[PDB]
């Protein structure tokens, strides 16, 4: 982000989502319009956890609510 706003280089590869977040706060950078590797956020999940179904359907409500 530093050298980006500094424009010491052509463009900056980053999370295009997070790019939209940064372009939101500061528009001094023009992000591309391309589409690649679009997934989403995450949380720590290791093997068996009540967060398996709890977090799964929990997300189902998250978008659902």
């Amino acid at each position: 982000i530093q050298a980006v706003r500094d424009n010491k280089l052509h463009a900056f590869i980053w999370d295009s989502a997070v790019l939209e977040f940064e372009a939101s706060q500061k528009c001094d950078l023009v992000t591309t319009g391309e589409l690649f590797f679009r997934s989403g956020f995450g949380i720590g999940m290791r093997k068996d956890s009540p967060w398996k179904q709890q977090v799964s359907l929990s997300i189902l409500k998250s978008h659902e609510n």
């Binding site: 679009r38 799964s56 359907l57 189902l60 409500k61 659902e64």
Partner: protein, 147 residues
């Protein structure tokens, strides 16, 4: 009990899918409903089928709702899905928002906004889940058929 050929994006995803996966594909077609929705005691559709294990491997892609989530073991998203509505032809009209009264009570509003889904509309059930005001406006807005 008659064979009829198939195609489509998700179908191809199955082609390469089972291909690398190495799982011999038996492709059938469905009769009742679209995907499925709890009818009275169970899903009204292929959700019930694979749920009844009428399909050990479920086919098709429709984003699983929380109901469809808790239904049974579900696949991962193949692509991002979502709700929407067609807009004829700037623009900037809409109504107000998804569950907003301009959509939810559009007949109550001066200009009517009538848009909806077909019988047991999946996105409509989501609305039926989300907000029933438009589900009443669906009385004015009830869709039938796709094209």
């Amino acid at each position: 009990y008659i064979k009829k050929c198939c195609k489509g994006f998700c179908i191809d995803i199955l082609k390469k899918i089972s291909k690398s996966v190495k799982f011999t594909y038996d492709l059938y077609l469905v009769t009742n409903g679209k995907h499925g929705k709890k009818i009275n005691g169970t899903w009204n559709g292929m959700i019930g089928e694979v749920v009844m294990k009428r399909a050990y491997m479920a086919v098709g892609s429709l984003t699983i709702n929380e109901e469809r989530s808790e239904v049974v073991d579900f696949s991962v998203p193949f692509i991002e899905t979502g709700i929407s509505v067609m807009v004829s032809r700037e623009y900037v009209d809409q109504v107000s928002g998804l569950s907003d009264k301009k959509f939810q009570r559009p007949n109550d509003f001066s200009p009517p906004f009538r848009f909806g889904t077909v019988p047991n509309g999946s996105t409509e059930r989501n609305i039926r889940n989300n907000y029933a005001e438009m589900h009443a406006y669906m009385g004015k807005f009830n869709q039938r058929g796709v094209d």
